[PDB]
């Protein structure tokens, strides 16, 4: 699986236990040193962002290589696998450990390994079940917003409604004398004022109750493990169902199956097959991240509190009202039942191997895998809707097929020469292939609910053009590694690899990589008689690795269709082309030290790494005068340097008690070395960041000083200039030359985590914490809720009432008619400490199952996920983001009770 001198972190099955999410990488936030995992949505159909030893490139992806049982997969396919089938998870964060897997092995690989049946004479059955709820985890951002009449008085005073207008003249006949809108619709012209009050100036509408809910979560599973004299099997079926926390629907529901099987046919051949399948239903809330008027957390913060989405009985209405609108705005349940969507995906993973051992020593091994998924989605827009722009309805069907095949063949030969010189050779071949496909077809113009096939729409100007997409790639690799070992205390590993990809041109597709590593067992040679210490191994490595994750057709100079008339065709220039595109080459030096004391009762590991990346694939931004947005190129280089260290112990006292703890830490320092055009620095436009030589990608902002107490204007520091009294010079006119690079970082430098666990006679309690410090984020929601210049129709912060006037002069918030800039007062400290899980179990005593041979195990749980976070970021979530906090889906706080009957 990996070398002996490598950097391997193995996570056991108990940390991959029942977790009530489909995103399995979020269960590893804080369990591996160096590997940092951050997810950006509480969406059930969300996929985590993993980075091992910092970011390695700027254009290509820095995701690891996810491998489930030899053949390599993607995280969406892993999301349809039952997590109760996984035996362990090895993370190989080295250049000598990742030397037989290569497609993006410079980012590290993640080896998921599935469970196999133990070989007892009586098989094992296990029935798991669970049920829980999920809620929003933060409410503090809407604790300092305005109320209804307070916002109306603030708007009337600031001159938004009129130049000479009062509160009653605005609230009476301008935006409450808009029964003129509700009197145009037959469904609700007799409900205004009777059971439907859309504008209510006396209460405050709870907009959090109208946009977010409490969502259930269920899972069930049943597994049969067994094994006779030669064969072994693990079969399993189960289902998972998670509902969306937000009122805009986004669920996840899968029915799974798994059959791992292994057998020894004779004394010469051993065969095996581990094959799985799934039927899955996804849906995503695709409005989070954009700023629409009444949607998301931006909608729970900014909607005025004198607009009522509820009826008189407390239920959610079908429509609400915003002033100036020409049709009523639909709420999220009505918009969900008038725009249906349904997906259905069928996934199958077939995977098999055969080992042949002809002579003593060498074993040949052949392995082949197929990964097929057929997805089929449907969308509607329902006819005869009164609050729509048309009485006609539309429909759209889509069919996806993604097929990925793989073949891999090794031949290992191990031997000794005299007594203590054990060599091992390994040569091998690897071929990966992929071919995807998308077909789509829509229709529109339907007038009935029942008559809505695609062949029943209008046939004139209501026709449209279908959809078709094709993608494909391939990889071919030849590798060989050699392990030499002395008697007990010296191991030396040497490996060569040739990689060829389909993503690069025919003269640049092949690259050669190598790795040399070593391990020295100091305890078994020098200090073999000791009182306290019990293990000491030193290990070091150096190897070069490639990265080839850009896109499939990024090196051709292409010409596409662009039709002008309907009589002839027309061609346009599509891309620019780069004939000299090739791999990105990362050389990593590693040096570690792994101790151990009190015979297992203190383990400590310390690592050091460099990881220099050359010929870095940047999607370089061409100037706008070329007519192209960007183009992939091999220009630039960027360094890292880091330490990471973990230590675990056991501090129990009595026979009954069992107390253990673990701690885990990583720090690194990014550094860019060469950009792309002879440039010293490059600022990414309206993102807030900058790439500079000798620094990480820092933030690039103006510095906010305060306000001017004599006139009320905002003030910014002039960079570089110092006044005569030592103070820094300010100015009140904004310009783009007031911006400078500030000493923050987009990628956080310090990650870590720590775990505690106590036990008793049965009753056990485990608590896991994760933390990230050094993380800053631009709070983009505070641009909208803390400005008096524009967007006065929305709800504002409560601090915009002590604004600078001619009477109120000693204050801190500026005058009204000013737009704010994106400067250092919108940059916030998003450094958090979470409580990831708090599982409390109680395995039932073995004396309870005495005469009955039908049962023989039972456990219960009381699990709470994300129930505590400590940070100083005021934006519903510090983890859900990365460079900005837009209209975001916050994470979930979940309470789950389960049961397990093992019999």
């Amino acid at each position: 699986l990996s070398t002996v001198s490598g950097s391997v972190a193995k996570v056991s099955s108990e940390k991959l236990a029942e977790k009530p999410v489909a995103n399995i990488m979020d269960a590893l936030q804080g369990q591996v040193a160096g590997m940092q995992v951050m997810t950006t949505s509480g969406d059930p159909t969300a996929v985590a962002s993993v980075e091992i030893h910092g970011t390695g490139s700027l254009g290509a992806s820095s995701a690891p290589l996810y491998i489930v049982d030899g053949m390599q997969t993607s995280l969406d396919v892993v999301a349809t696998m039952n997590p109760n089938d996984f035996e362990s998870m090895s993370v190989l964060k080295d250049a000598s450990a990742t030397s037989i897997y290569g497609a993006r092995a410079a980012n590290g690989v993640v080896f998921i390994q599935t469970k196999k049946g133990k070989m007892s004479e009586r098989g094992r059955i296990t029935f798991n079940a669970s049920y829980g709820i999920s809620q929003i985890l933060n409410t503090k951002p809407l604790d300092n917003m305005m109320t209804g009449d307070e916002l109306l008085d603030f708007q009337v005073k600031a001159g938004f409604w009129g130049n000479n207008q009062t509160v009653q003249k605005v609230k009476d006949m301008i935006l409450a004398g808009a029964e003129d809108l509700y009197g145009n619709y037959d469904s609700l012209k007799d409900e205004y004022g009777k059971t439907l009050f859309p504008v209510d100036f006396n209460h405050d509408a709870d907009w959090l109750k109208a946009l977010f809910k409490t969502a259930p979560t269920s899972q069930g599973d049943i597994s049969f493990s067994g094994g006779s004299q030669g064969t072994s099997y693990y079969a399993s079926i189960g289902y998972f169902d998670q509902e969306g926390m937000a009122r805009e629907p986004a669920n996840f529901k899968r029915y799974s199956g798994r059959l791992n099987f292994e057998s020894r046919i004779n004394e010469w051949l051993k065969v095996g097959a581990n094959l799985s399948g799934a039927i899955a239903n996804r849906r995503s809330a695709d409005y989070f991240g954009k700023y629409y008027m009444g949607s998301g957390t931006f909608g729970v913060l900014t909607m005025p509190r004198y607009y009522n989405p509820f009826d008189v009985n407390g239920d959610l209405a079908d429509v609400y009202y915003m002033y100036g609108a020409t049709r009523p705005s639909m709420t999220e349940p009505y918009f969900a039942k008038m725009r249906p969507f349904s997906s259905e995906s069928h996934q199958a993973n077939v995977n098999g191997f055969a080992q042949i051992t002809p002579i003593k020593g060498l074993t040949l091994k052949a392995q082949a895998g197929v990964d097929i998924t057929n997805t089929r989605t449907s969308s509607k827009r329902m006819p005869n809707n009164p609050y729509d722009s048309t009485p006609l309805g539309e429909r759209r069907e889509r069919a996806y097929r993604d097929v990925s095949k793989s073949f891999t063949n090794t031949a290992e030969y191990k031997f000794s020469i005299d007594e203590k010189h054990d060599l091992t050779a390994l040569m091998g071949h690897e071929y990966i292939e992929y071919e995807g496909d998308v077909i789509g077809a829509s229709s529109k113009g339907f007038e009935s609910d029942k008559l809505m096939l695609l062949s029943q729409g209008k046939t004139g100007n209501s026709l449209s053009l279908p959809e078709h997409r094709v993608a494909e790639y391939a990889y071919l690799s030849f590798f060989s590694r050699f392990n030499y070992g002395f008697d007990k205390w010296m191991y030396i590993d040497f490996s060569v690899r040739n990689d060829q990809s389909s993503r690069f041109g025919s003269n640049n597709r092949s690259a050669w990589f190598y790795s040399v590593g070593g391990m020295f067992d100091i305890y078994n040679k020098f200090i073999q008689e000791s009182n306290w210490l019990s293990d000491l191994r030193l290990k070091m490595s150096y190897g070069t690795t490639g990265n080839s994750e850009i896109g499939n057709y990024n090196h051709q100079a292409l010409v596409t269709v662009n039709n002008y008339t309907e009589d002839a065709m027309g061609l346009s220039i599509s891309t620019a082309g780069n004939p000299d595109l090739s791999w990105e080459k990362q050389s990593q030096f590693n040096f570690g030290l792994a101790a151990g004391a009190f015979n297992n009762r203190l383990s400590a590991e310390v690592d050091f790494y460099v990881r220099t990346t050359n010929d870095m694939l940047i999607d370089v931004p061409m100037p706008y005068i070329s007519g192209f947005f960007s183009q992939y190129q091999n220009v630039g280089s960027m360094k890292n340097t880091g330490v990471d260290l973990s230590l675990k112990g056991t501090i129990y006292q009595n026979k009954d008690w069992n107390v253990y703890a673990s701690a885990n830490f990583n720090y690194n320092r990014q550094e860019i070395t060469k950009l792309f055009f002879g440039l010293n620095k490059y600022m990414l436009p309206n993102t807030g960041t900058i790439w500079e030589i000798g620094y990480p990608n820092s933030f690039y902002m103006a510095e906010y000083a305060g306000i001017d107490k004599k006139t009320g204007k905002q003030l910014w520091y002039v960079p570089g200039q110092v006044d005569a009294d030592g103070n820094k010079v300010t100015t009140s006119q904004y310009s783009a030359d007031l911006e400078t690079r500030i000493d923050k970082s987009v990628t956080p430098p310090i990650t870590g985590g720590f775990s505690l666990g106590a036990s008793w006679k049965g009753l056990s309690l485990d608590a896991d914490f994760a933390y990230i410090v050094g993380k800053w984020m631009i709070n983009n929601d505070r641009y909208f809720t803390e400005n008096g210049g524009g967007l006065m129709q929305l709800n504002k912060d409560k601090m915009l009432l002590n604004a600078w006037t001619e009477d109120n002069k000693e204050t801190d918030v500026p005058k009204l008619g000013q737009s704010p800039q994106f400067d250092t007062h919108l940059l916030e400290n998003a450094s958090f400490l979470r409580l990831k899980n708090l599982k409390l179990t109680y395995v039932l005593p073995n004396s309870l199952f005495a005469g009955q041979n039908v049962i023989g195990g039972a456990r219960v749980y009381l699990m709470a996920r994300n129930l505590l976070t400590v940070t100083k970021y005021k934006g519903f979530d510090p983890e859900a983001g990365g460079n900005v906090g837009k209209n975001q889906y916050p994470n979930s706080k979940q309470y789950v009770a389960g049961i397990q009957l093992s019999f």
Partner: peptide, 13 residues
Amino acid sequence: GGATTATTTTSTS
């Protein structure tokens, strides 16, 4: 939704 409100910053990484 409707009437997208503006002056947002683009997100790299």
